[PDB]
Every structure is written in structure tokens, then in C-alpha cells.
Amino acid sequence: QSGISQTVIVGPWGAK
Amino acid sequence: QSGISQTVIVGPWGAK
Amino acid sequence: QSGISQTVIVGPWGAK
Amino acid sequence: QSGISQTVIVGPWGAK
Amino acid sequence: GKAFDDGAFTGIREINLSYNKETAIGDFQVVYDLNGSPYVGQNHKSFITGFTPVKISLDFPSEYIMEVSGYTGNVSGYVVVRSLTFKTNKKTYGPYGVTSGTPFNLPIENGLIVGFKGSIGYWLDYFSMYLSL
Amino acid sequence: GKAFDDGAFTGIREINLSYNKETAIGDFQVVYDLNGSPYVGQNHKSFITGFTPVKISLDFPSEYIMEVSGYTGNVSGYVVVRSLTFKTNKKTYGPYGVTSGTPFNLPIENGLIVGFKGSIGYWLDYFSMYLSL
Amino acid sequence: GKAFDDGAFTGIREINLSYNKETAIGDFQVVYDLNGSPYVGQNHKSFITGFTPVKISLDFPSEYIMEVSGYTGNVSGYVVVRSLTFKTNKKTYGPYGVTSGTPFNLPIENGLIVGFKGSIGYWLDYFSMYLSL
Amino acid sequence: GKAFDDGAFTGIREINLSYNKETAIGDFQVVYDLNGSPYVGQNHKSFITGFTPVKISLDFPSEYIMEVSGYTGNVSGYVVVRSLTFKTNKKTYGPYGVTSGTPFNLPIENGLIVGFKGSIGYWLDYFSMYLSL
Ligand SMILES: [O-]S(O)(O)c1ccc(-c2c3nc(c(-c4ccc(S([O-])(O)O)cc4)c4ccc([nH]4)c(-c4ccc(S([O-])(O)O)cc4)c4nc(c(-c5ccc(S([O-])(O)O)cc5)c5ccc2[nH]5)C=C4)C=C3)cc1
Numbered sequence: 001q002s003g004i005s006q007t008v009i010v011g012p013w014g015a016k
Numbered sequence: 017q018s019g020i021s022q023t024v025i026v027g028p029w030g031a032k
Numbered sequence: 033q034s035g036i037s038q039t040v041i042v043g044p045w046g047a048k
Numbered sequence: 049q050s051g052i053s054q055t056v057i058v059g060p061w062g063a064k
Numbered sequence: 065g066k067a068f069d070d071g072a073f074t075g076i077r078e079i080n081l082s083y084n085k086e087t088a089i090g091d092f093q094v095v096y097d098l099n100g101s102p103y104v105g106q107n108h109k110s111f112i113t114g115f116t117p118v119k120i121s122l123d124f125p126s127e128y129i130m131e132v133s134g135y136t137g138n139v140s141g142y143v144v145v146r147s148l149t150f151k152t153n154k155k156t157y158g159p160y161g162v163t164s165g166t167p168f169n170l171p172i173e174n175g176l177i178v179g180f181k182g183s184i185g186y187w188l189d190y191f192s193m194y195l196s197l
Numbered sequence: 198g199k200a201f202d203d204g205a206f207t208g209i210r211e212i213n214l215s216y217n218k219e220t221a222i223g224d225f226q227v228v229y230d231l232n233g234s235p236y237v238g239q240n241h242k243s244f245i246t247g248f249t250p251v252k253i254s255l256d257f258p259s260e261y262i263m264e265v266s267g268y269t270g271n272v273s274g275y276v277v278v279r280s281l282t283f284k285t286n287k288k289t290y291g292p293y294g295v296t297s298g299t300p301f302n303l304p305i306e307n308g309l310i311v312g313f314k315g316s317i318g319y320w321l322d323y324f325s326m327y328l329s330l
Numbered sequence: 331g332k333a334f335d336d337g338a339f340t341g342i343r344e345i346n347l348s349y350n351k352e353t354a355i356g357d358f359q360v361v362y363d364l365n366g367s368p369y370v371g372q373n374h375k376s377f378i379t380g381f382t383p384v385k386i387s388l389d390f391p392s393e394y395i396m397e398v399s400g401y402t403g404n405v406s407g408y409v410v411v412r413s414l415t416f417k418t419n420k421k422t423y424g425p426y427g428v429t430s431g432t433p434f435n436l437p438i439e440n441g442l443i444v445g446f447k448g449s450i451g452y453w454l455d456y457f458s459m460y461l462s463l
Numbered sequence: 464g465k466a467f468d469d470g471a472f473t474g475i476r477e478i479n480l481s482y483n484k485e486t487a488i489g490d491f492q493v494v495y496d497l498n499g500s501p502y503v504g505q506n507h508k509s510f511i512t513g514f515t516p517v518k519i520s521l522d523f524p525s526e527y528i529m530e531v532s533g534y535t536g537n538v539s540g541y542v543v544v545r546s547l548t549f550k551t552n553k554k555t556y557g558p559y560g561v562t563s564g565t566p567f568n569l570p571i572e573n574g575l576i577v578g579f580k581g582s583i584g585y586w587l588d589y590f591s592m593y594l595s596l
Pocket residue numbers: 065066067109110111139140141142184185186187
């Protein structure tokens with residue numbers, strides 16, 4: 001792990 | 017708050 | 033729930 | 049990342 | 065339908081579902097990971113029979129779902145989940161069922177699906193997913 | 198398009214977007230909440246002009262988004278987000294844009310959208326959302 | 331000592347520990363909540379006997395731990411957890427054991443303890459806790 | 464004392480504190496990371512002067528705090544934080560202040576400190592930390 005906080009991310013929708 | 021742990025929940029998809 | 037994001041918070045240590 | 053869910057863990061206290 | 069809620073776990077090891085190409089998804093059962101050990105979830109079964117079974121065995125923990133997509137549509141007057149597709153970092157499982165109706169898709173950039181909840185009458189009425197880091 | 202990533206914040210206070218009924222969504226900017234204070238995010242602008250502006254002011258923190266839906270489709274050879282709809286616990290904002298193409302929808306049972314990332318060339322190419330409790 | 335790791339769950343329903351006033355904590359076992367149902371964790375036992383047992387039954391889910399404190403100290407040449415105190419929003423359980431050595435305390439403003447890990451030889455050598463919203 | 468609450472951020476880049484070896488910690492200020500950019504937090508200052516300043520510059524994001532420890536004790540009738548020590552995966556910063564009174568320590572096996580809150584009158588009265596993955 002690094003010192004950067006993480007968050008759930010959903011997507012992307014649109015041009016893949 | 018209560019003593020029950022929470023989680024992100026997405027949906028529902030299908031019959032609303 | 034409200035529209036404010038939550039985080040775990042530990043403490044406080046020092047004057048109660 | 050792997051397929052195992054993570055949680056904050058504090059400690060240990062006692063024999064290091 | 066009969067509502068079910070497996071709750072949240074540590075990961076997913078295996079998914080067992082059934083479907084019929086003329087209607088929709090029927091049975092749904094998941095083998096979860098619970099802190100490193102398999103945890104067999106309750107088998108959520110359709111009231112009727114006549115569904116081909118499918119077993120999706122994931123190479124846990126190196127393989128995990130990155131996208132869930134499918135279709136919802138009308139079957140005998142009610143809206144149900146007619147099709148499901150599971151894409152992992154390794155391969156694509158599906159589509160299973162009928163790819164007709166309104167599509168939906170949930171791609172995940174960061175995070176994991178750690179649980180399912182939903183309802184099943186004759187078919188899978190709807191479903192929701194628990195997400196976590 | 199030009200990629201952008203606002204990152205994660207504590208909540209959303211205001212959304213400013215623009216669109217054109219013959220094409221797609223163009224500009225996109227968000228006023229976030231950062232630990233109780235407004236935080237103005239960078240204005241992500243289309244390379245061209247000719248978009249009607251829309252301001253969505255949420256009664257933060259009592260009002261929050263519960264579902265985001267829209268359509269993605271082809272505009273001049275490329276796939277773009279042509280329409281967006283925001284539903285909060287209070288009301289529905291939209292649809293804004295053109296409701297044609299492939300629909301997508303993200304209903305949230307528990308949790309909050311706390312950030313956006315995406316790309317904009319002439320139009321909004323794609324977008325992703327940060328979710329948190 | 332023999333390491334153990336119960337992992338993360340949805341909550342805590344009951345804690346069973348044992349101790350001896352001249353030495354330290356010995357046995358440690360927890361009944362967790364797993365999505366609304368009790369889940370009995372493995373009994374982590376000391377290699378020796380001679381410990382008075384203690385049962386802490388929480389009125390789950392309305393009662394939950396808000397602070398864990400105790401003392402670590404030397405017993406026969408090694409550092410061990412000699413005492414533990416659990417304070418919930420309802421009352422205080424403990425101290426159990428010997429209140430001598432170096433104190434430690436973990437007050438929680440927001441969040442929940444959802445799991446334990448540690449090691450036990452003759453006594454509880456050390457322990458860590460899983461925290462979650 | 465005067466209460467303060469910086470809130471939650473994405474990480475910590477720099478910590479600036481001051482202390483006096485005969486009393487306790489006085490000033491406290493943090494430079495946070497906010498989605499990749501530095502975010503200067505409000506300078507929380509003691510009502511009095513006479514404190515030696517300390518600058519802790521972390522090699523963000525490769526260096527992060529893994530343990531915070533210190534001492535709380537009586538100074539002129541009131542309980543205050545008299546000492547603080549920050550241990551990262553790279554090295555140890557401190558102790559800063561007076562190592563007398565009641566010790567406390569928060570080791571972190573997994574997770575990150577992403578924010579601080581507390582109170583300062585003449586000295587740092589108390590403090591709490593936001594933790595996140
Ligand atoms: O608002 S609306 O108007 O939109 C509207 C929305 C939804 C409904 C329906 C509905 N069920 C249907 C079928 C059905 C009929 C016909 C065909 S078709 O003819 O083929 O097309 C296809 C499908 C259908 C088939 C089988 C079941 N339903 C079964 C069931 C499953 C499994 C078994 S088992 O175990 O024996 O296998 C036994 C029984 C159950 N259904 C419930 C149940 C329920 C009870 C209590 C509680 S609670 O109060 O919370 O406790 C919560 C939920 C509800 C609540 C509403 C509801 N079912 C519980 C079990 C079709 C519609 C009506 C109107």
C-alpha cells in the first residue's frame with residue numbers, strides 16, 4: 001500500500 | 017449509529 | 033443517512 | 049489489487 | 065417474489081445460476097469467501113423448474129469480477145432480469161439467458177462486489193450488489 | 198478527449214452541465230463539499246460552443262443523489278454521453294440532452310457519490326463516479 | 331504463542347474471555363454477527379488452565395463497544411496483555427485481569443470494531459482489531 | 464480550549480507542530496494531500512508563545528505514518544497532550560515534548576490517517592484522528 005487513500009469507483013460509461 | 021456494519025449497495029436492477 | 037460522507041474516527045486522547 | 053476485501057486494522061498491542 | 069439478502073462477505077469464489085432461453089434467469093446461489101474460507105450461501109430457487117444450470121468457478125483470489133451486465137425485460141406481465149454476463153480480469157462468463165429488453169451495466173474501476181440481494185418468484189425479479197474495497 | 202479527474206470529496210453541493218439537443222453533453226463542472234465548506238471543482242469545458250447551461254443546486258446535506266442515469270450513443274463517429282438524469286431523494290433533474298442510444302443507470306441503495314472523473318473532447322466522452330459511505 | 335485471526339464480520343454479539351489476577355488474560359472467544367445471524371468464532375485457548383471465565387453479552391445491535399483499554403506487562407519474561415476493559419454505549423465491562431504495566435486505550439468516535447486477531451501461548455501475547463463503518 | 468476539525472483528506476504531506484520541554488505541545492498545523500495536490504490546513508495556534516517549531520516533511524506518497532504515540536498529563540491543573548511521536552515506514556519523528564504522564568499509542572496494521580481534529584487553549588488539549596483505507 002501507498003500513502004494515498006482509496007475509494008470505490010464505478011464506470012466508465014461512454015467511449016470505452 | 018447502531019452496532020451493525022454498513023457497506024455501499026448499488027441497485028436494484030429489474031422490477032422496481 | 034444524510035449527504036455527508038463518513039470516516040472512521042479514533043480518539044480523543046487527552047482532556048476527556 | 050486482489051479479490052480479497054480489506055478493512056482498517058489497528059494494533060497490535062502487547063508483545064511486538 | 066421471495067426476497068433474499070445474502071449480506072456482505074470478503075469475496076466471491078463461485079456463482080451458480082440457471083436460466084431458460086425463452087424466459088429469464090431462475091435460480092441463483094453464491095459461494096462466498098469469508099475471511100479465507102468458503103461460505104456457501106443459501107440456494108435461492110425459482111418456484112418452477114426447467115432451467116439449465118451454470119457454474120462459474122473463479123480462481124479466487126487472483127480472479128475477481130470487474131463488470132456485471134445484463135438485460136431486464138417483460139416476461140408474462142412482470143419485469144424480470146432476463147440475462148446476466150460476468151466479466152472478470154481473466155475472462156467473460158456469459159451472456160446467460162435472453163439478451164433482449166433494456167440493458168444495464170456496472171463496470172468497476174476500483175472495488176469489489178462482496179454480496180448480493182434480490183428477489184425470485186418464478187424468475188429473478190431484481191437484484192442489488194454490495195460493493196467494498 | 199481531454200481527461201479530467203476531480204477526485205473524492207465529502208459530498209456534492211452543485212452540478213453545472215451544458216448540452217445541445219442535437220448532439221450531447223458538453224461542459225461539466227461540480228461544486229463539492231469539502232468537510233463542510235464548498236469546494237469549486239475545475240470547469241471541464243468542451244472545445245466548441247453552442248450548449249445550453251444547466252444549474253442543479255442541491256439542498257446539501259439533506260438532499261443527495263440516489264440515482265444517475267443517461268444514454269450513450271454515436272455522435273459524428275464517436276461514442277459519447279448524450280444524456281444525463283439525476284434523481285435525488287427530493288426530486289428528478291433532467292433528462293438533459295438527447296434520450297437516444299444505449300441506456301445505463303446507477304441506482305444507489307446505500308452510499309454516496311463523492312466525485313467524478315471523465316473526459317471531454319467536443320462532448321463528454323465518458324465518465325466514472327467515486328462512491329463512499 | 332499460537333497466532334489466530336478471526337477476520338472481519340458485521341458486528342459483535344458476545345465476548346468470552348478468561349483471566350487470572352496474578353498473571354494475565356488467557357482464553358479469548360467471540361460470537362460475531364454475520365449479516366444478522368450469530369457466527370461463533372473459534373475458541374482461542376491458553377496452553378494452561380486456571381483462569382476464571384467471563385461472559386460479556388451485548389444487547390446487539392443497540393449496544394456496541396466504544397472504547398477498549400487495558401494494560402500490557404511482563405509475565406515470566408515475556409510481554410503479554412494483562413488486562414482488558416470494554417466500554418459500550420450502555421456500560422463498562424471490566425477491568426478483567428491485572429491493572430499493572432503499560433496502559434493503552436482505543437476510544438472510537440465513529441466506527442465499529444468488527445473483528446479480532448492476535449496470539450495466545452500461555453497468555454494473550456498481543457491483539458489487533460478490525461475497524462469499519 | 465478552542466476546538467478545531469480539519470476533516471478528512473486523501474493523505475498527509477507535512478506536519479508542523481511546536482512544543483516546550485517544560486510543558487506540552489502548543490501549535491499544530493498539517494499540510495494534507497487532496498487528490499494529488501497539497502492542501503494547507505488552518506494553523507491551529509496556542510494562545511501563548513514560547514514553543515520551538517518542528518517540521519515533519521513526509522516523502523508522500525511512499526512514506527506514511529504507521530504509528531502515533533505520545534503522553535497525556537497534567538499541566539497547570541488541566542490534562543493536555545504533552546508529547547507526540549510519529550513513526551512512518553521510513554523512520555521515527557520524535558519524541559517531541561515531555562515524555563511524562565500516561566502513555567497512549569495507535570499502531571496501524573492496515574489503513575491511513577487522513578485527518579485530525581482536536582482543541583488547543585494554551586496547549587493541545589486533546590486530539591482524534593480520521594482513519595481510512
Ligand atoms: O406493485 S405491483 O403491482 O407492481 C406488484 C409487484 C409485485 C407483486 C408480487 C408478485 N409475485 C409474483 C409471482 C409470479 C406470479 C405469476 C407469474 S406468471 O403467471 O408465470 O407470469 C410469475 C411470477 C410469484 C411466484 C412465486 C412467488 N411470487 C413467491 C414464492 C416464491 C417461492 C416459493 S417456494 O419457496 O415455495 O419455492 C413460494 C412463493 C413469493 N412472492 C412473495 C411476495 C412477498 C410476500 C411477503 C413479503 S413481506 O411482507 O416482506 O414478508 C414480501 C414479499 C410478493 C410480494 C409482492 C409480490 N410477491 C413471497 C413469495 C408476481 C408478482 C404483485 C404486485
